Design a protein around this ligand. Structure first.
Ligand code: A1AWE
Ligand code: A1AWE
Lengths: 277, 277
């Protein structure tokens, strides 16, 4: 495929995953942007991946697509089967990843506002519970806060699957080559250069200062196996979030928790949703 | 073509040529490199573009290819016709631009050493006079110093056609937009991403600290037209070199001095070579 992918493959080989994401972020600034939610390229209409039973007033689940350049409307396919006849599961796309190619968001708030609009239109009057994995976990929380402060509509809950927020990212740096190697392993087709630029841009968004904590209760789902070696004397390698409502540990590692062990994640979410309703 | 080209086009549209060259330099570090002159991809054999008359001991002219990503073995075609029946003119390629694609030089000295080997093999025992335009002007002098100090073979002269060395580059930054538009206008084909990366890497080499002046006499050739608008209170907009042996002004601007007015450049060179011989 493209040169950015080739360069990225080399950087992951050289254990410089982080340095090249910075290049991707810098480079992405020259892509055409949208500065208002109105100006967004894509239809962010959420895709219905599971239907719950027939009713009322039950929360619907919204999957917030992660940052991975190999990602897309297939992240939640395996997870969603476990919600069939249990909950509606809607997957909302991340602006900048579609198809010309898609405009990039001018800042993260403009992307969130475009998602907030499509989510409120699709969910109707049902309460919404936001779910995201890894980078998507961080996006799920920023979308939660945006819905609350800017659209006056806080979600009923947030599910954070293996989040590594700023200040708790030491494991994610020690294992960066495993993380970089994971992106290339997950390729169904080659990662496009446009999507790699989108990924770098969003990675930079999420490293920035985003004060503002959602009111919504948090289910923290954590992998149980480390992704790489780790001396326990360094402290905890696990995913972290401040003051969760509930913590669930599931089999697998950062990656496999969402593949081979997706049902374990779904079971933790379903038990948690009943508890808070 | 490729995404680096797409981004670069947007950058010159947005008048951010300089910022995007910095991106190209950063991305170029993730390209395959050669760390010793032996390991060089290309043959670098100079191409004979003009023949002088039959002799002995007259200098041959060596054209040092510039950094332009749209460049190649055609930079000196129009200029060289004016040396036919006057001087041998050899055009030596710049390492990193050929064909797989070509390895990038790990530093500038490795590229210069690879060129030094091919030039000495080609020039035989004739004295050598290096010629370069703009960025190539800077490369010719770094090559002159390299030939003298590293290969014990100082050239007989250097011809610097419109050089803007560090510390005298203010006019060429103000006109960076015209430089970028010139690159795209000059495209015989689309600039490949590999060559844009090479161009960025060489630009970075040539901004860095390179003390050390060649012993060889310098003919400084200067355009007479500004490339763009210019407030005279900013000073002299013209190309600069410290303590030139001879200064020649020719019609045209930074660009057209080598196109429509190449014969005036050649006439300045031919008189100069006779004086110093
Ligand atoms: C999930 O892994 O995100 C996909 C991009 S991987 C990147 C190194 C990463 C990993 C984690 C978080 C963010 C993030 N990122 O986009 O920078 O958070 C949680 O774990
Ligand atoms: C000649 O114009 O070189 C073509 C590439 S433009 C690049 C920014 C540049 C422009 C000039 C000089 C060097 C140079 N460079 O750093 O490569 O010098 C003269 O004008």
């Amino acid at each position: 495929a493209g040169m950015f992918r080739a360069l990225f493959r080399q950087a992951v080989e050289d254990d410089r995953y982080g340095e090249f994401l910075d290049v991707l972020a810098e480079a992405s600034a020259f892509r055409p942007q949208f500065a208002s939610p109105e100006a967004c390229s894509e239809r962010l209409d959420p895709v219905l991946l599971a239907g719950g039973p027939t009713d009322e007033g039950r929360a619907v689940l919204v999957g917030c697509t992660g940052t991975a350049a190999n990602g897309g409307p297939h992240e939640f396919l395996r997870l969603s089967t476990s919600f069939q006849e249990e909950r509606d599961f809607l997957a909302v796309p991340l602006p900048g990843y579609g198809t010309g190619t898609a405009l990039l968001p001018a800042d993260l708030d403009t992307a969130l506002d475009a998602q907030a609009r499509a989510i409120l239109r699709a969910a109707g009057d049902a309460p919404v519970v936001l779910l995201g994995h890894a980078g998507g976990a961080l996006l799920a929380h920023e979308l939660a806060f945006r819905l609350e402060r800017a659209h006056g509509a806080p979600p009923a809950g947030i599910v954070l699957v293996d989040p590594y927020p700023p200040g708790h990212q030491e494991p994610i740096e020690v294992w960066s080559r495993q993380l970089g190697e994971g992106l290339f392993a997950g390729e169904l087709e080659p990662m496009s250069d446009a999507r790699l630029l989108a990924m770098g841009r969003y990675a930079r968004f999420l490293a920035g200062p985003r004060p503002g904590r959602s009111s919504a209760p948090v289910l923290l789902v954590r992998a149980s196996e480390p992704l790489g070696d780790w001396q326990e004397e360094r402290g905890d390698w696990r995913a972290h979030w401040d003051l969760p409502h509930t913590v669930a540990d599931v089999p697998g590692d950062h990656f496999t928790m969402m593949r081979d062990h997706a049902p374990a994640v779904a079971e933790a979410v379903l038990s948690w949703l009943d508890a808070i309703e």
